[PDB]
Amino acid sequence: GSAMGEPDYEVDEDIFRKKRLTIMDLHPGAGKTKRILPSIVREALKRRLRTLILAPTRVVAAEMEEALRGLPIRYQTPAVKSDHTGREIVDLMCHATFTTRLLSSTRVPNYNLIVMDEAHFTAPCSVAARGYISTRVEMGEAAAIFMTATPPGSIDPFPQSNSPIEDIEREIPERSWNTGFDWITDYQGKTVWFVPSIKAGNDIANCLRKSGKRVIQLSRKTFDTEYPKTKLTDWDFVVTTDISEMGANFRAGRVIDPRRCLKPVILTDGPERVILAGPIPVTPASAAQRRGRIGRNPAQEDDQYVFSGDPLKNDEDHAHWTEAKMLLDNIYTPEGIIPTLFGPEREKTQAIDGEFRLRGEQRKTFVELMRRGDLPVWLSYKVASAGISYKDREWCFTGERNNQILEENMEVEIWTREGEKKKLRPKWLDARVYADPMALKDFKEFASGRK
Ligand SMILES: [Cl-]
């Protein structure tokens, strides 16, 4: 005797049609959709299509490679601008790698089938990749597949799940507590707790550690290192920022979600600047992705989503929509069409297509500030469009007194590359380079010319 098992996945001819943009959901954790991506790729190769797979993070890329073992898959790093074999190959890369190559190479191939995993990712480079992709689709040049449970425009915080979820609304501490939340530490399962910031996570995680819980923390910069540890069975809590909304799978029974995030905002009252507004309520899609960490396994029916407060769907002041346009306006096509945002995302910005386009040296500086300097899109756009060269770091010290960077109420002071001690005082202020200490550590390194 034998068990039926997941049946072979027959591919809908429609998904390979030019001008077709398919939205699907892999429904992970029920052991029913293992063969989908491998079937799509094998069928794509059968049709002799030039295929691109976009993963949101390196971790997911690596998981896909294992899932696709035996198929002719070639992982592409952002350290390489283009990689053309003579052979039948599927390119695999990060959302951000695709966008970066579109910005620094005239050799990006004419993929006619593009699969974007976790296509809800609202990182600017991801938003930009989606515009480019859907532009190519509308031109009849490609077919695309956006895989995600919360496609752009979705507004449902309590979508379908593989297994039932108990949605529980109760007060959740935003800072360390010492009494009154016994349900948090009495629970005997594993928990994923979404915090609005690393700082909040630090407080929560240290409180939990004082009770003896084993806690793995996750943020954007530690994710590639720390997430693999969560795949070990030795923890009580994962404390994570919203980086874990993009394909992070956890063998957990409970999510705790105060539904708070920080949002970068371009302030235009006075000198343009970017602050990290908040903590403010998440969008409904983000609440759905957080909750969607659990209720994945239909044999485990008592998973819990513990949440507080309601989502806010209006996020049109998010800096990412403008930053997406800064990237898109700088991607050119032979057709010379400037790509536009994916349709559900067009309403997020009133910017006129092309208004951020840059020319010549400025364009490569822009690209280099982001790639090699690791600066936010907004900040990189300001530096490059002022005519500054990648290497020229004077602007990090010539800002107004208000732009003085503090750490612990101490004025940051560093060594220029040339050997002078100067107050860190950037001409343009983007809170993403100074709010988090490790981000400040990287920005100092940049200002000092070691980058
Ligand atoms: Cl983060």
| DSSP code per residue over 312-323 | ----TTBHHHHH
* Domain endpoint, select from 326, 352, 378: 352
- Between the CA of 262 and the centroid of ligand 1 the distance, in Å, is 10
Name the one residue in this structure whose structure tokens are 């909040």.
200
Q: How far is the CA of 398 from the centre of ligand 1 (A)?
A: 29
The alpha carbon of 232 and the centre of ligand 1 are apart by a number of angstroms equal to 21
User: What is the CA(134)–ligand 1 centre distance, in A?
Assistant: 28
CA of 411 relative to ligand 1 center, distance in Å: 25
30 and 147, same structural domain? Answer: yes
How remote is the CA of residue 207 from the centroid of ligand 1, in Å?
A: 20
With a CB cutoff of 8 Å and minimum separation 6, the contacts of 44 are 16, 51, 90, 113
Whether residue 288 contacts residue 157, with contact meaning beta carbons closer than 8 Å, is answered with: yes
DSSP annotation of 14 reads G
Residue in 299, 308, 305, 359 with CA at minimum distance from that of residue 332: 359
Q: Where do the H-state alpha helices sit in 85-150?
A: 95-104, 124-138
CA 293 to ligand 1 centroid distance, Å: 17
Task: State in Å: Cα 223 to ligand 1 middle.
Answer: 8
Of 181, 286, 304, nearest to 241 by C-alpha is 286
Burial call 134-172: b when 16+ CB within 10 Å, e when fewer? bbbbbeeebbbbbbbbbbbebeebebebbbebeeeeeeb
Q: Which two tokens stand for residue 74?
A: 């070639």
The Cα–Cα gap between 118 and 127 comes to 12
- Structure tokens that stand for 246 in this block: 């993009």
Question: What is the rounded CA–CA span in Å between residue 109 and residue 50?
Answer: 8
Ligand 1 centroid distance, CA of 276 (Å): 12
The verdict on 10 and 103 lying in the same domain is yes
| Claim to verify: residue 41 and residue 57 sit in the same structural domain | yes
Cβ distance 185 to 212 under 8 Å? Answer: no
> DSSP label at 152?
T
Q: Please give the distance, rounded to the nearest whole angstrom, from the Cα atom of residue 270 to the centre of ligand 1.
A: 28
Beginning with the edge strand found earlier in the chain, give each strand of the sheet holding 237-240 in spatial order.
Answer: 165-169, 303-307, 254-257, 191-194, 237-240, 215-218
- Among 352, 367, 402, which residue terminates a domain? 352
Beta carbons of 373 and 443 less than 8 angstroms apart: no
At a CB cut-off of 8 Å and minimum separation 6, what does 126 contact?
56, 95, 96, 99, 119
Q: Which amino acid is at 248?
A: A
| 107 and 84, same domain (yes or no) | yes
CA of 245 to the centre of ligand 1 (A): 11
Q: Are residues 222 and 361 in the same domain?
A: no
The residues with which 92 forms a beta bridge, in sequence order, are 53, 75
Tally Cβ neighbours within 10 Å of residue 113.
24
| Same domain membership, residue 222 and residue 260 | yes
DSSP state of 245: G
Does one domain contain both 67 and 1?
Answer: yes
Q: Are the CB atoms for 395 and 388 separated by under 8 Å?
A: yes
- Domain range for 200 is 155-314
Domain check: are 277 and 252 in the same one?
Answer: yes
The overall longest dimension of the chain from CA atoms, in Å, is 78
Distance 389 CA to ligand 1 centre (A): 29
Q: What is the DSSP letter of 49?
A: -
As a whole number of Å, the CA-based R_g of the chain is 23
| Way the structure was solved | X-ray
What resolution does the deposited structure have, in angstroms?
A: 2.1
CATH number of the domain enclosing 164? 3.40.50.300
Domains contained in the chain, number: 3
Identify the domain boundary among 292, 325, 352. 352
251 and 382 in a single domain? The answer is: no
Helices (H), 28-123: 36-46, 58-67, 95-104
Nearest of 68, 72, 60, 52 to residue 28 by alpha carbon: 60
Q: How far is the CA of 191 from the centre of ligand 1 (A)?
A: 18
Residues 147, 11 share a domain: yes
Same domain, 364 and 321: no
Residues 162 and 298 in one domain: yes
